[PDB]
Design a protein around this ligand. Structure first.
Ligand code: HEM
Ligand code: HEM
Ligand code: NAG
Ligand code: CA
Ligand code: CA
Lengths: 141, 416, 146
């Protein structure tokens, strides 16, 4: 339920992230792996060692998808149509894991960029990530 | 999101998005900059000369800089070309001072790399955005240190002169080392360094002398790239300037033949022209000569010559080329006491005239398994080495005798 | 038992740097504006409609001191957590009826608040120990429920 004032903060806050989005996504992926060990079961062949290239590579594509979603904030389900099918129909990722990644991503943004995370921005960026998780998991069964 | 074609009388006539929507932020307020073209100026500040330093832009009396996010070697080239310095080599520069910081910035989206000036290539933003994560833009054009050899009789020798900005000056011997001389010969495309001479051997120079002493690694492709450190001025007298001789000091010409790709071989040494000896003129040396002449690859060398011996004295120079070196200077040469060449035995070559595909290891092949001799103090003696696959190997000394080494000396061309 | 000795040292170390007066008000103010269904329980604290009022309300800041201190008291001994929070868990289960999830949400917000206040020092192994601490506290305050 992103209000027009809520989307303005999301676009502005994501803009201040800049080119460091790919590294932020990679750090969040690594942060969630060690903090929630059960999450590693969904990555069978990926190397889970700290600083791995695949983790860095995966973080870049995850942040790429989110940055695409911000530019298409009005129409999210179409911009995330391919990812929704892969995450729900192929890998059958449980929806509980998405709230873990969203929390870890917010922590990474808050720690690395503390000055811009006013409480107004925190709520707006939280609602944006909740919208992404629901879209991806809306066809889980 | 106003999308004007470029000819509408007013902006409201253009097709633009609604007065709402799109969730814009007040830091994204658009602006314009209209100018006659004479107020904008580009300068380099903070470096040794005008061709290296931090990029500084002065537009409408307002000072500013250029952000690094879109910077590349293509954009570095167009800026150096506009200043008239030359090509761009390094995107970093060695600092001689500190430049004042400025809040205003200039941003480059993309630049084709062949434009005349920086202003011409599309969508350069002047102010309105900040890049704190990014940093300043630095360049180092190729006119920072341009070397030149003056007053040498042979083509690739003379007094060393280095250009700073738009002025010339000589370099003292103490500043110039062997590693610095190798870069200078490579930069000038004169080959590798053969020798270095000091004490104004080539001649007594004239003008002002630089103070800084070059401290380069040795394999830099340009003089400007290697770091330098300033030194006190006047420590070297004018008679202490340096001279450099590079390896490509040979001048060999094809004559009598209507097409430059064919004719009798002529060599100029000791200040006179002379024909080359027919002996020891094989295909491998022929390819290098035609490569020097820029004719291209060669496929045939005449057995004898219809062109004649010529009026000049018969040169007894013999060359031992591997077949891959570009110029005849890089080929090892032996001429001390070479056997006399009869009058009718004069060398010649018939180059194709096509400069394509050069030579590839396998006709027109660089060959494989060529033996080399190392640590022997010369090219005719040393430990035997065999090139197999991509490695060099030796031979066990057992069952090795004169009859066994007779073939090796013959293949290398040394003899017995 | 629950935590390795190296993990325990870092958790106790960071808790020294904290500003108890302001951290408690920060986390409570964030939960009341991010998840705006907890404003029902804090109607005794006055106006809470707008985020600045939530942050600037003295009552939530004072209640933040109580929440933070109880968290520090829980950190005293981990095995006692059943007995440490038994007195408080009854209040949150029989009188206010606070759902166990809100304990898990407040702890998660606390990790974000600590990361915001500290920065790079919130090393991923450090937050892993903190999450294990938070999960136990949320379970301990909910184990009274039956
Ligand atoms: C906002 C949340 C998420 C986003 C934006 C996202 C995005 C992506 C992207 C861009 C890819 C690459 C697909 C490809 O290259 O073809 C991917 C693959 C994957 N996703 Fe996610 N993801 C999210 C959450 C999750 C979570 C929480 C999990 C597991 C707990 C997960 C499981 C996976 C796995 C295992 C792959 C690997 C697929 C492969 O290697 O072929 N996703 N995701
Ligand atoms: C998660 C760990 C929590 C701890 C350690 C904690 C701690 C405390 C403590 C010690 C008190 C006593 C204050 C007093 O008696 O004056 C209190 C009161 C209260 N807490 Fe919590 N709390 C937690 C979570 C929550 C959450 C998430 C809510 C959400 C609404 C909540 C709602 C309340 C309310 C309404 C009171 C007022 C009780 C009254 O007025 O009688 N608590 N809390
Ligand atoms: C520069 O090169 C591009 C292709 O890289 C070409 O399209 C363009 O016309 C060229 N411009 C000039 C001025 O030569
Ligand atoms: Ca437009
Ligand atoms: Ca032996």
């Amino acid at each position: 339920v992103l209000s027009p004032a809520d989307k303005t903060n999301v676009k502005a806050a994501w803009g201040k992230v800049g080119a460091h989005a790919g590294e932020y996504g990679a750090e969040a992926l690594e942060r969630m792996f060690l903090s929630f060990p059960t999450t590693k079961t969904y990555f069978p062949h990926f190397d889970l060692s700290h600083g791995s290239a695949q983790v860095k590579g995966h973080g870049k594509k995850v942040a790429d998808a989110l940055t695409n979603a911000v530019a298409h904030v009005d129409d999210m389900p179409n911009a995330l149509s391919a990812l929704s099918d892969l995450h729900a129909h192929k890998l059958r990722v449980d929806p509980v894991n998405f709230k873990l990644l969203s929390h870890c991503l917010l922590v990474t943004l808050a720690a690395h960029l503390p000055a811009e995370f006013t409480p107004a921005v925190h709520a707006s960026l939280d609602k944006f990530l909740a919208s992404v998780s629901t879209v991806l998991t809306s066809k889980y069964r | 999101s106003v999308s004007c074609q470029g000819h509408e009388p007013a902006i409201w006539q253009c097709k633009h998005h609604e007065w709402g929507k799109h969730y814009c932020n007040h830091n994204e307020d658009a602006g314009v900059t209209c100018s006659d073209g004479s107020d904008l100026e580009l300068r380099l500040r903070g470096g040794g000369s005008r061709c290296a330093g931090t990029v500084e832009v002065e537009i409408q009396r307002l000072l500013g800089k250029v952000c690094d996010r879109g910077w590349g070697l293509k954009e570095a080239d167009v800026v150096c070309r506009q200043l008239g310095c030359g090509s761009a080599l390094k995107t970093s520069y060695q600092v001689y001072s500190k430049i004042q910081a400025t809040n205003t910035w200039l941003f480059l989206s993309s630049c084709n790399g062949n434009e005349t000036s920086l202003w011409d290539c599309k969508n350069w933003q002047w102010g309105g955005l900040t890049c704190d994560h990014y940093e300043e833009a630095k360049i180092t054009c190729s006119a920072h240190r341009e070397p030149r050899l003056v007053g040498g009789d042979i083509p690739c020798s003379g007094r060393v002169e280095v250009k700073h900005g738009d002025t010339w000056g000589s370099i003292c011997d103490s500043d110039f080392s062997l590693e610095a001389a190798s870069v200078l010969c490579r930069e000038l495309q004169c080959g590798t360094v053969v020798s270095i001479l000091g004490g104004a051997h080539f001649g007594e120079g004239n003008g002002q002398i630089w103070a800084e002493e070059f401290q380069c690694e040795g394999h830099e492709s340009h003089l400007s790239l290697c770091p330098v450190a300033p030194r006190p001025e006047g420590t070297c007298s004018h008679s202490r300037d340096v001279g450099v001789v590079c390896s490509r000091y040979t001048e060999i010409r094809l004559v009598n033949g209507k097409t430059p790709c064919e004719g009798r071989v002529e060599l100029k040494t000791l200040g006179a022209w002379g024909s080359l000896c027919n002996s020891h003129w094989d295909i491998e040396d022929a390819h290098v000569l035609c490569q020097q002449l820029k004719c291209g690859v060669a496929l045939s060398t005449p057995g004898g010559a219809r062109f004649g011996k010529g009026n000049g004295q018969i040169w007894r120079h013999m060359f031992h080329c591997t077949g891959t070196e570009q110029h005849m200077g890089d080929c090892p040469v032996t001429a001390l006491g070479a056997s006399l060449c009869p009058s009718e035995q004069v060398a010649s070559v018939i180059c194709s005239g096509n400069q394509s595909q050069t030579l590839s290891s396998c006709v027109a092949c660089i060959e494989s398994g060529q033996l080399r001799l190392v640590n022997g103090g010369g090219r005719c003696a040393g430990r035997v080495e065999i090139y197999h696959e991509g490695s060099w190997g030796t031979i066990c000394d057992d069952s090795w005798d004169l009859s066994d080494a007779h073939v090796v000396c013959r293949q290398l061309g040394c003899g017995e | 038992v629950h935590l390795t000795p190296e993990e325990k040292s870092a958790v106790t170390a960071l808790w020294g740097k904290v500003n108890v007066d302001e951290v408690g008000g920060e986390a409570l103010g964030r939960l009341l504006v991010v998840y705006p269904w907890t404003q029902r329980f804090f109607e005794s604290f006055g106006d809470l409609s707008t985020p600045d009022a939530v942050m600037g309300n003295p009552k939530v800041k004072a209640h933040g001191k109580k929440v933070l201190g109880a968290f520090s008291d829980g950190l005293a001994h981990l095995d006692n957590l059943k007995g440490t929070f038994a007195t408080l868990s009854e209040l949150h289960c029989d009188k206010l009826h606070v759902d166990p999830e809100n304990f898990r949400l407040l702890g998660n917000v606390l990790v974000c608040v600590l990361a915001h206040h500290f920065g790079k020092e919130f090393t991923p192994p450090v937050q892993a120990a903190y999450q294990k601490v938070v999960a136990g506290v949320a379970n301990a305050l909910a184990h009274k429920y039956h």
